[PDB]
Amino acid sequence: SNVPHKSSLPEGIRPGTVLRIRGLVPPNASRFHVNLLCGEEQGSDAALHFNPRLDTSEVVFNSKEQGSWGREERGPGVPFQRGQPFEVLIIASDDGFKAVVGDAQYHHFRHRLPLARVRLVEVGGDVQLDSVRIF
Amino acid sequence: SNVPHKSSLPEGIRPGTVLRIRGLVPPNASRFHVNLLCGEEQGSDAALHFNPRLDTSEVVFNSKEQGSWGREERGPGVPFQRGQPFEVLIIASDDGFKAVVGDAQYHHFRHRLPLARVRLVEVGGDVQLDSVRIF
């Protein structure tokens, strides 16, 4: 079912914070996502929207501010396959977020909103989440 | 074995850099080390010297500056054992290096030298490396 997973970042995040997401992509998976949000309310801003699309074969990055989406960036290829498990690392640095998918740097997303406003991680869509660890 | 391993970091490292080292501690291992050096010269300054000592059951962290070693810091116990594989994440943040071993925050080493001087990662001693990835 789709009740996204929600995880609080109490101290929030800073350069050096690492998010490790492990999961498995369902066989008929259409697409899933990972959002770094700035509040717990519906429609609060999203510092990062990472959205791997299996059906359209593309991975979309984007942010949402004041209620409207922004400049959508796309990554090189789709490092995910249906029925296969994956490990993603989202690394916050001073100039942006580094997305590492299974041992390879996949994309660098420069900060659009301030890192200090990020307060929670939401993982939703067509995905079997095994665990979310923050280091 | 695997290697008196060397990885050059031409542009250095910044907050948000992740070092992932995987390997095996062989059967009669005494000790091994992971060094973040400032140059290629022998006896180069070290921003970080991570030294698990299996023969004495301690994990030591230190730095080397201008040819002389600093004061050693010891971590909480030995999360390594002979005949067992391991995974270590050394994450650089704004105020120090976080050492993560076996999926748990193990120690935090406050910076002693500017992160900007680091130029090489060297892994050596009684260890059989699987891989060293820098993200």
GROMACS .gro file of C-alpha atoms in nm:
model
  270
    1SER     CA    1   0.000   0.000   0.000
    2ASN     CA    2   0.108   0.361  -0.033
    3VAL     CA    3   0.149   0.536   0.300
    4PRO     CA    4   0.495   0.675   0.242
    5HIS     CA    5   0.755   0.588   0.501
    6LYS     CA    6   0.835   0.889   0.719
    7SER     CA    7   1.157   0.953   0.911
    8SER     CA    8   1.233   1.258   1.123
    9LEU     CA    9   1.570   1.433   1.112
   10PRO     CA   10   1.561   1.597   1.458
   11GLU     CA   11   1.891   1.784   1.440
   12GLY     CA   12   1.816   1.828   1.072
   13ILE     CA   13   2.102   1.769   0.831
   14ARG     CA   14   2.441   1.923   0.754
   15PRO     CA   15   2.734   1.860   0.522
   16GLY     CA   16   2.855   1.516   0.616
   17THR     CA   17   2.510   1.368   0.675
   18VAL     CA   18   2.455   1.042   0.490
   19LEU     CA   19   2.121   0.881   0.411
   20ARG     CA   20   2.130   0.512   0.333
   21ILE     CA   21   1.820   0.366   0.174
   22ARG     CA   22   1.797  -0.004   0.099
   23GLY     CA   23   1.501  -0.160  -0.073
   24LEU     CA   24   1.373  -0.370  -0.359
   25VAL     CA   25   1.190  -0.262  -0.671
   26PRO     CA   26   0.861  -0.458  -0.713
   27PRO     CA   27   0.831  -0.651  -1.045
   28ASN     CA   28   0.552  -0.433  -1.189
   29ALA     CA   29   0.700  -0.120  -1.032
   30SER     CA   30   0.606   0.197  -1.222
   31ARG     CA   31   0.803   0.447  -1.013
   32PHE     CA   32   0.898   0.548  -0.663
   33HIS     CA   33   1.048   0.847  -0.486
   34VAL     CA   34   1.252   0.989  -0.201
   35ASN     CA   35   1.165   1.337  -0.075
   36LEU     CA   36   1.364   1.554   0.161
   37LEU     CA   37   1.095   1.784   0.300
   38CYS     CA   38   1.106   2.098   0.512
   39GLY     CA   39   0.798   2.037   0.726
   40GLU     CA   40   0.546   1.769   0.822
   41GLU     CA   41   0.246   1.934   0.653
   42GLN     CA   42   0.098   1.828   0.320
   43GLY     CA   43   0.269   2.030   0.052
   44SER     CA   44   0.553   2.165   0.264
   45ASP     CA   45   0.862   2.248   0.054
   46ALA     CA   46   1.091   1.970  -0.077
   47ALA     CA   47   1.464   2.040  -0.080
   48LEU     CA   48   1.509   1.726  -0.292
   49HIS     CA   49   1.272   1.511  -0.494
   50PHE     CA   50   1.443   1.199  -0.632
   51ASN     CA   51   1.207   1.007  -0.857
   52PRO     CA   52   1.331   0.697  -1.051
   53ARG     CA   53   1.080   0.621  -1.328
   54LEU     CA   54   1.094   0.261  -1.447
   55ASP     CA   55   0.808   0.289  -1.697
   56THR     CA   56   0.951   0.599  -1.873
   57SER     CA   57   1.311   0.488  -1.804
   58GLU     CA   58   1.441   0.808  -1.646
   59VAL     CA   59   1.538   0.940  -1.302
   60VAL     CA   60   1.405   1.285  -1.222
   61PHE     CA   61   1.549   1.526  -0.966
   62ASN     CA   62   1.364   1.842  -0.864
   63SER     CA   63   1.264   2.070  -0.579
   64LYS     CA   64   0.935   2.229  -0.481
   65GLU     CA   65   0.913   2.576  -0.329
   66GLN     CA   66   0.618   2.773  -0.195
   67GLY     CA   67   0.396   2.511  -0.356
   68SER     CA   68   0.537   2.501  -0.711
   69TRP     CA   69   0.789   2.268  -0.876
   70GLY     CA   70   1.115   2.385  -1.030
   71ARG     CA   71   1.383   2.309  -1.286
   72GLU     CA   72   1.372   1.931  -1.323
   73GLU     CA   73   1.714   1.769  -1.372
   74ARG     CA   74   1.752   1.417  -1.509
   75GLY     CA   75   2.024   1.165  -1.434
   76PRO     CA   76   2.225   0.946  -1.678
   77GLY     CA   77   2.024   0.628  -1.734
   78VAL     CA   78   1.824   0.420  -1.487
   79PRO     CA   79   2.042   0.236  -1.233
   80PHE     CA   80   1.740   0.040  -1.106
   81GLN     CA   81   1.575  -0.276  -1.240
   82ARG     CA   82   1.243  -0.440  -1.143
   83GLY     CA   83   1.257  -0.732  -0.900
   84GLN     CA   84   1.609  -0.623  -0.807
   85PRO     CA   85   1.722  -0.483  -0.468
   86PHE     CA   86   1.912  -0.152  -0.456
   87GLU     CA   87   2.117   0.061  -0.218
   88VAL     CA   88   2.118   0.436  -0.253
   89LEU     CA   89   2.330   0.683  -0.060
   90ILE     CA   90   2.222   1.047  -0.050
   91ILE     CA   91   2.517   1.255   0.062
   92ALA     CA   92   2.481   1.619   0.173
   93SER     CA   93   2.787   1.837   0.106
   94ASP     CA   94   2.818   2.218   0.122
   95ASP     CA   95   2.727   2.264  -0.242
   96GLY     CA   96   2.462   1.996  -0.291
   97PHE     CA   97   2.345   1.636  -0.263
   98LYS     CA   98   2.540   1.348  -0.413
   99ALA     CA   99   2.331   1.047  -0.514
  100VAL     CA  100   2.523   0.722  -0.516
  101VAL     CA  101   2.345   0.416  -0.651
  102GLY     CA  102   2.511   0.081  -0.592
  103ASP     CA  103   2.878   0.185  -0.568
  104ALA     CA  104   2.879   0.460  -0.830
  105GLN     CA  105   2.822   0.834  -0.801
  106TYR     CA  106   2.509   0.885  -1.004
  107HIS     CA  107   2.425   1.255  -0.992
  108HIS     CA  108   2.515   1.575  -0.808
  109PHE     CA  109   2.218   1.800  -0.730
  110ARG     CA  110   2.309   2.152  -0.628
  111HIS     CA  111   2.120   2.301  -0.333
  112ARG     CA  112   1.818   2.507  -0.434
  113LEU     CA  113   1.675   2.552  -0.084
  114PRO     CA  114   1.890   2.583   0.230
  115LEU     CA  115   2.014   2.251   0.370
  116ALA     CA  116   1.912   2.373   0.713
  117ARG     CA  117   1.539   2.366   0.639
  118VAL     CA  118   1.528   1.991   0.564
  119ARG     CA  119   1.350   1.815   0.850
  120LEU     CA  120   1.232   1.480   0.723
  121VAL     CA  121   1.270   1.198   0.473
  122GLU     CA  122   0.977   1.048   0.292
  123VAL     CA  123   1.007   0.738   0.075
  124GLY     CA  124   0.702   0.642  -0.130
  125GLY     CA  125   0.568   0.494  -0.450
  126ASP     CA  126   0.631   0.148  -0.595
  127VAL     CA  127   0.905   0.027  -0.365
  128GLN     CA  128   0.965  -0.230  -0.089
  129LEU     CA  129   1.165  -0.035   0.166
  130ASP     CA  130   1.398  -0.244   0.375
  131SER     CA  131   1.552   0.036   0.587
  132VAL     CA  132   1.654   0.402   0.607
  133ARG     CA  133   1.968   0.482   0.807
  134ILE     CA  134   2.110   0.823   0.874
  135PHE     CA  135   2.479   0.849   0.952
  136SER     CA  136   4.699  -0.999  -0.008
  137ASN     CA  137   4.519  -0.696  -0.156
  138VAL     CA  138   4.755  -0.398  -0.138
  139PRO     CA  139   4.962  -0.139   0.055
  140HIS     CA  140   4.679   0.063  -0.104
  141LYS     CA  141   4.699   0.414  -0.243
  142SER     CA  142   4.426   0.643  -0.380
  143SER     CA  143   4.513   0.995  -0.488
  144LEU     CA  144   4.274   1.282  -0.420
  145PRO     CA  145   4.405   1.561  -0.652
  146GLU     CA  146   4.130   1.806  -0.557
  147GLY     CA  147   4.139   1.704  -0.190
  148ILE     CA  148   3.825   1.635   0.010
  149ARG     CA  149   3.541   1.849   0.148
  150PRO     CA  150   3.264   1.807   0.407
  151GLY     CA  151   3.035   1.545   0.259
  152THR     CA  152   3.310   1.311   0.140
  153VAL     CA  153   3.257   0.944   0.216
  154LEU     CA  154   3.527   0.679   0.224
  155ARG     CA  155   3.396   0.321   0.216
  156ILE     CA  156   3.652   0.050   0.287
  157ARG     CA  157   3.561  -0.318   0.280
  158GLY     CA  158   3.792  -0.605   0.344
  159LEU     CA  159   3.888  -0.908   0.543
  160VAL     CA  160   4.104  -0.917   0.858
  161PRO     CA  161   4.318  -1.226   0.797
  162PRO     CA  162   4.360  -1.517   1.045
  163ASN     CA  163   4.668  -1.394   1.228
  164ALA     CA  164   4.644  -1.021   1.168
  165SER     CA  165   4.818  -0.800   1.421
  166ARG     CA  166   4.702  -0.460   1.303
  167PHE     CA  167   4.624  -0.245   0.999
  168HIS     CA  168   4.572   0.120   0.919
  169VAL     CA  169   4.389   0.375   0.705
  170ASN     CA  170   4.580   0.704   0.660
  171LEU     CA  171   4.459   1.036   0.514
  172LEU     CA  172   4.793   1.188   0.412
  173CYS     CA  173   4.886   1.538   0.296
  174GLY     CA  174   5.142   1.429   0.041
  175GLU     CA  175   5.317   1.142  -0.133
  176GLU     CA  176   5.647   1.185   0.053
  177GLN     CA  177   5.733   0.924   0.317
  178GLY     CA  178   5.645   1.043   0.666
  179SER     CA  179   5.399   1.294   0.523
  180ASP     CA  180   5.161   1.477   0.760
  181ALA     CA  181   4.843   1.282   0.839
  182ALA     CA  182   4.503   1.443   0.890
  183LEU     CA  183   4.390   1.101   1.010
  184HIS     CA  184   4.554   0.774   1.112
  185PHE     CA  185   4.291   0.507   1.191
  186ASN     CA  186   4.464   0.207   1.348
  187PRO     CA  187   4.276  -0.105   1.461
  188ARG     CA  188   4.521  -0.313   1.669
  189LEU     CA  189   4.404  -0.674   1.696
  190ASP     CA  190   4.711  -0.788   1.887
  191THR     CA  191   4.641  -0.542   2.172
  192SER     CA  192   4.264  -0.505   2.132
  193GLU     CA  193   4.237  -0.130   2.082
  194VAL     CA  194   4.143   0.102   1.798
  195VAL     CA  195   4.365   0.412   1.784
  196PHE     CA  196   4.305   0.746   1.606
  197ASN     CA  197   4.579   1.007   1.573
  198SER     CA  198   4.720   1.274   1.344
  199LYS     CA  199   5.076   1.358   1.242
  200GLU     CA  200   5.179   1.718   1.188
  201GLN     CA  201   5.523   1.850   1.098
  202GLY     CA  202   5.686   1.514   1.157
  203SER     CA  203   5.549   1.454   1.504
  204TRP     CA  204   5.248   1.252   1.619
  205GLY     CA  205   4.968   1.404   1.819
  206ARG     CA  206   4.785   1.264   2.120
  207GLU     CA  207   4.612   0.930   2.050
  208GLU     CA  208   4.235   0.895   2.094
  209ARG     CA  209   4.092   0.547   2.156
  210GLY     CA  210   3.755   0.424   2.033
  211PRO     CA  211   3.508   0.215   2.239
  212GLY     CA  212   3.633  -0.142   2.206
  213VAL     CA  213   3.733  -0.347   1.900
  214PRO     CA  214   3.459  -0.401   1.642
  215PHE     CA  215   3.693  -0.616   1.426
  216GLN     CA  216   3.799  -0.979   1.451
  217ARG     CA  217   4.047  -1.208   1.279
  218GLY     CA  218   3.885  -1.422   1.012
  219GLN     CA  219   3.595  -1.178   0.965
  220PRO     CA  220   3.510  -0.928   0.689
  221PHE     CA  221   3.424  -0.567   0.770
  222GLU     CA  222   3.288  -0.244   0.626
  223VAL     CA  223   3.411   0.095   0.747
  224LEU     CA  224   3.271   0.436   0.646
  225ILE     CA  225   3.488   0.737   0.729
  226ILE     CA  226   3.271   1.044   0.672
  227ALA     CA  227   3.418   1.390   0.665
  228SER     CA  228   3.193   1.659   0.808
  229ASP     CA  229   3.248   2.023   0.907
  230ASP     CA  230   3.401   1.953   1.248
  231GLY     CA  231   3.554   1.607   1.212
  232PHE     CA  232   3.559   1.254   1.073
  233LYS     CA  233   3.284   1.010   1.173
  234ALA     CA  234   3.400   0.647   1.181
  235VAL     CA  235   3.119   0.399   1.118
  236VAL     CA  236   3.192   0.030   1.162
  237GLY     CA  237   2.950  -0.253   1.097
  238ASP     CA  238   2.654  -0.014   1.052
  239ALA     CA  239   2.706   0.173   1.381
  240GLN     CA  240   2.853   0.513   1.464
  241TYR     CA  241   3.177   0.417   1.633
  242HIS     CA  242   3.385   0.731   1.692
  243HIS     CA  243   3.404   1.099   1.604
  244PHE     CA  244   3.748   1.252   1.544
  245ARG     CA  245   3.749   1.632   1.561
  246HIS     CA  246   3.964   1.785   1.283
  247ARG     CA  247   4.321   1.867   1.378
  248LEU     CA  248   4.446   1.970   1.030
  249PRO     CA  249   4.247   2.152   0.759
  250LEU     CA  250   4.056   1.903   0.542
  251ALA     CA  251   4.198   2.096   0.247
  252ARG     CA  252   4.551   1.958   0.289
  253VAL     CA  253   4.450   1.591   0.237
  254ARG     CA  254   4.585   1.447  -0.089
  255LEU     CA  255   4.613   1.071  -0.052
  256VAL     CA  256   4.441   0.777   0.114
  257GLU     CA  257   4.661   0.486   0.204
  258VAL     CA  258   4.547   0.152   0.347
  259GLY     CA  259   4.804  -0.096   0.472
  260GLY     CA  260   4.902  -0.354   0.729
  261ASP     CA  261   4.744  -0.694   0.801
  262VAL     CA  262   4.428  -0.665   0.593
  263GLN     CA  263   4.305  -0.810   0.261
  264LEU     CA  264   4.111  -0.537   0.088
  265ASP     CA  265   3.794  -0.597  -0.101
  266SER     CA  266   3.753  -0.230  -0.209
  267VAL     CA  267   3.806   0.139  -0.130
  268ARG     CA  268   3.551   0.377  -0.283
  269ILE     CA  269   3.546   0.753  -0.231
  270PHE     CA  270   3.217   0.937  -0.278
   0.00000   0.00000   0.00000
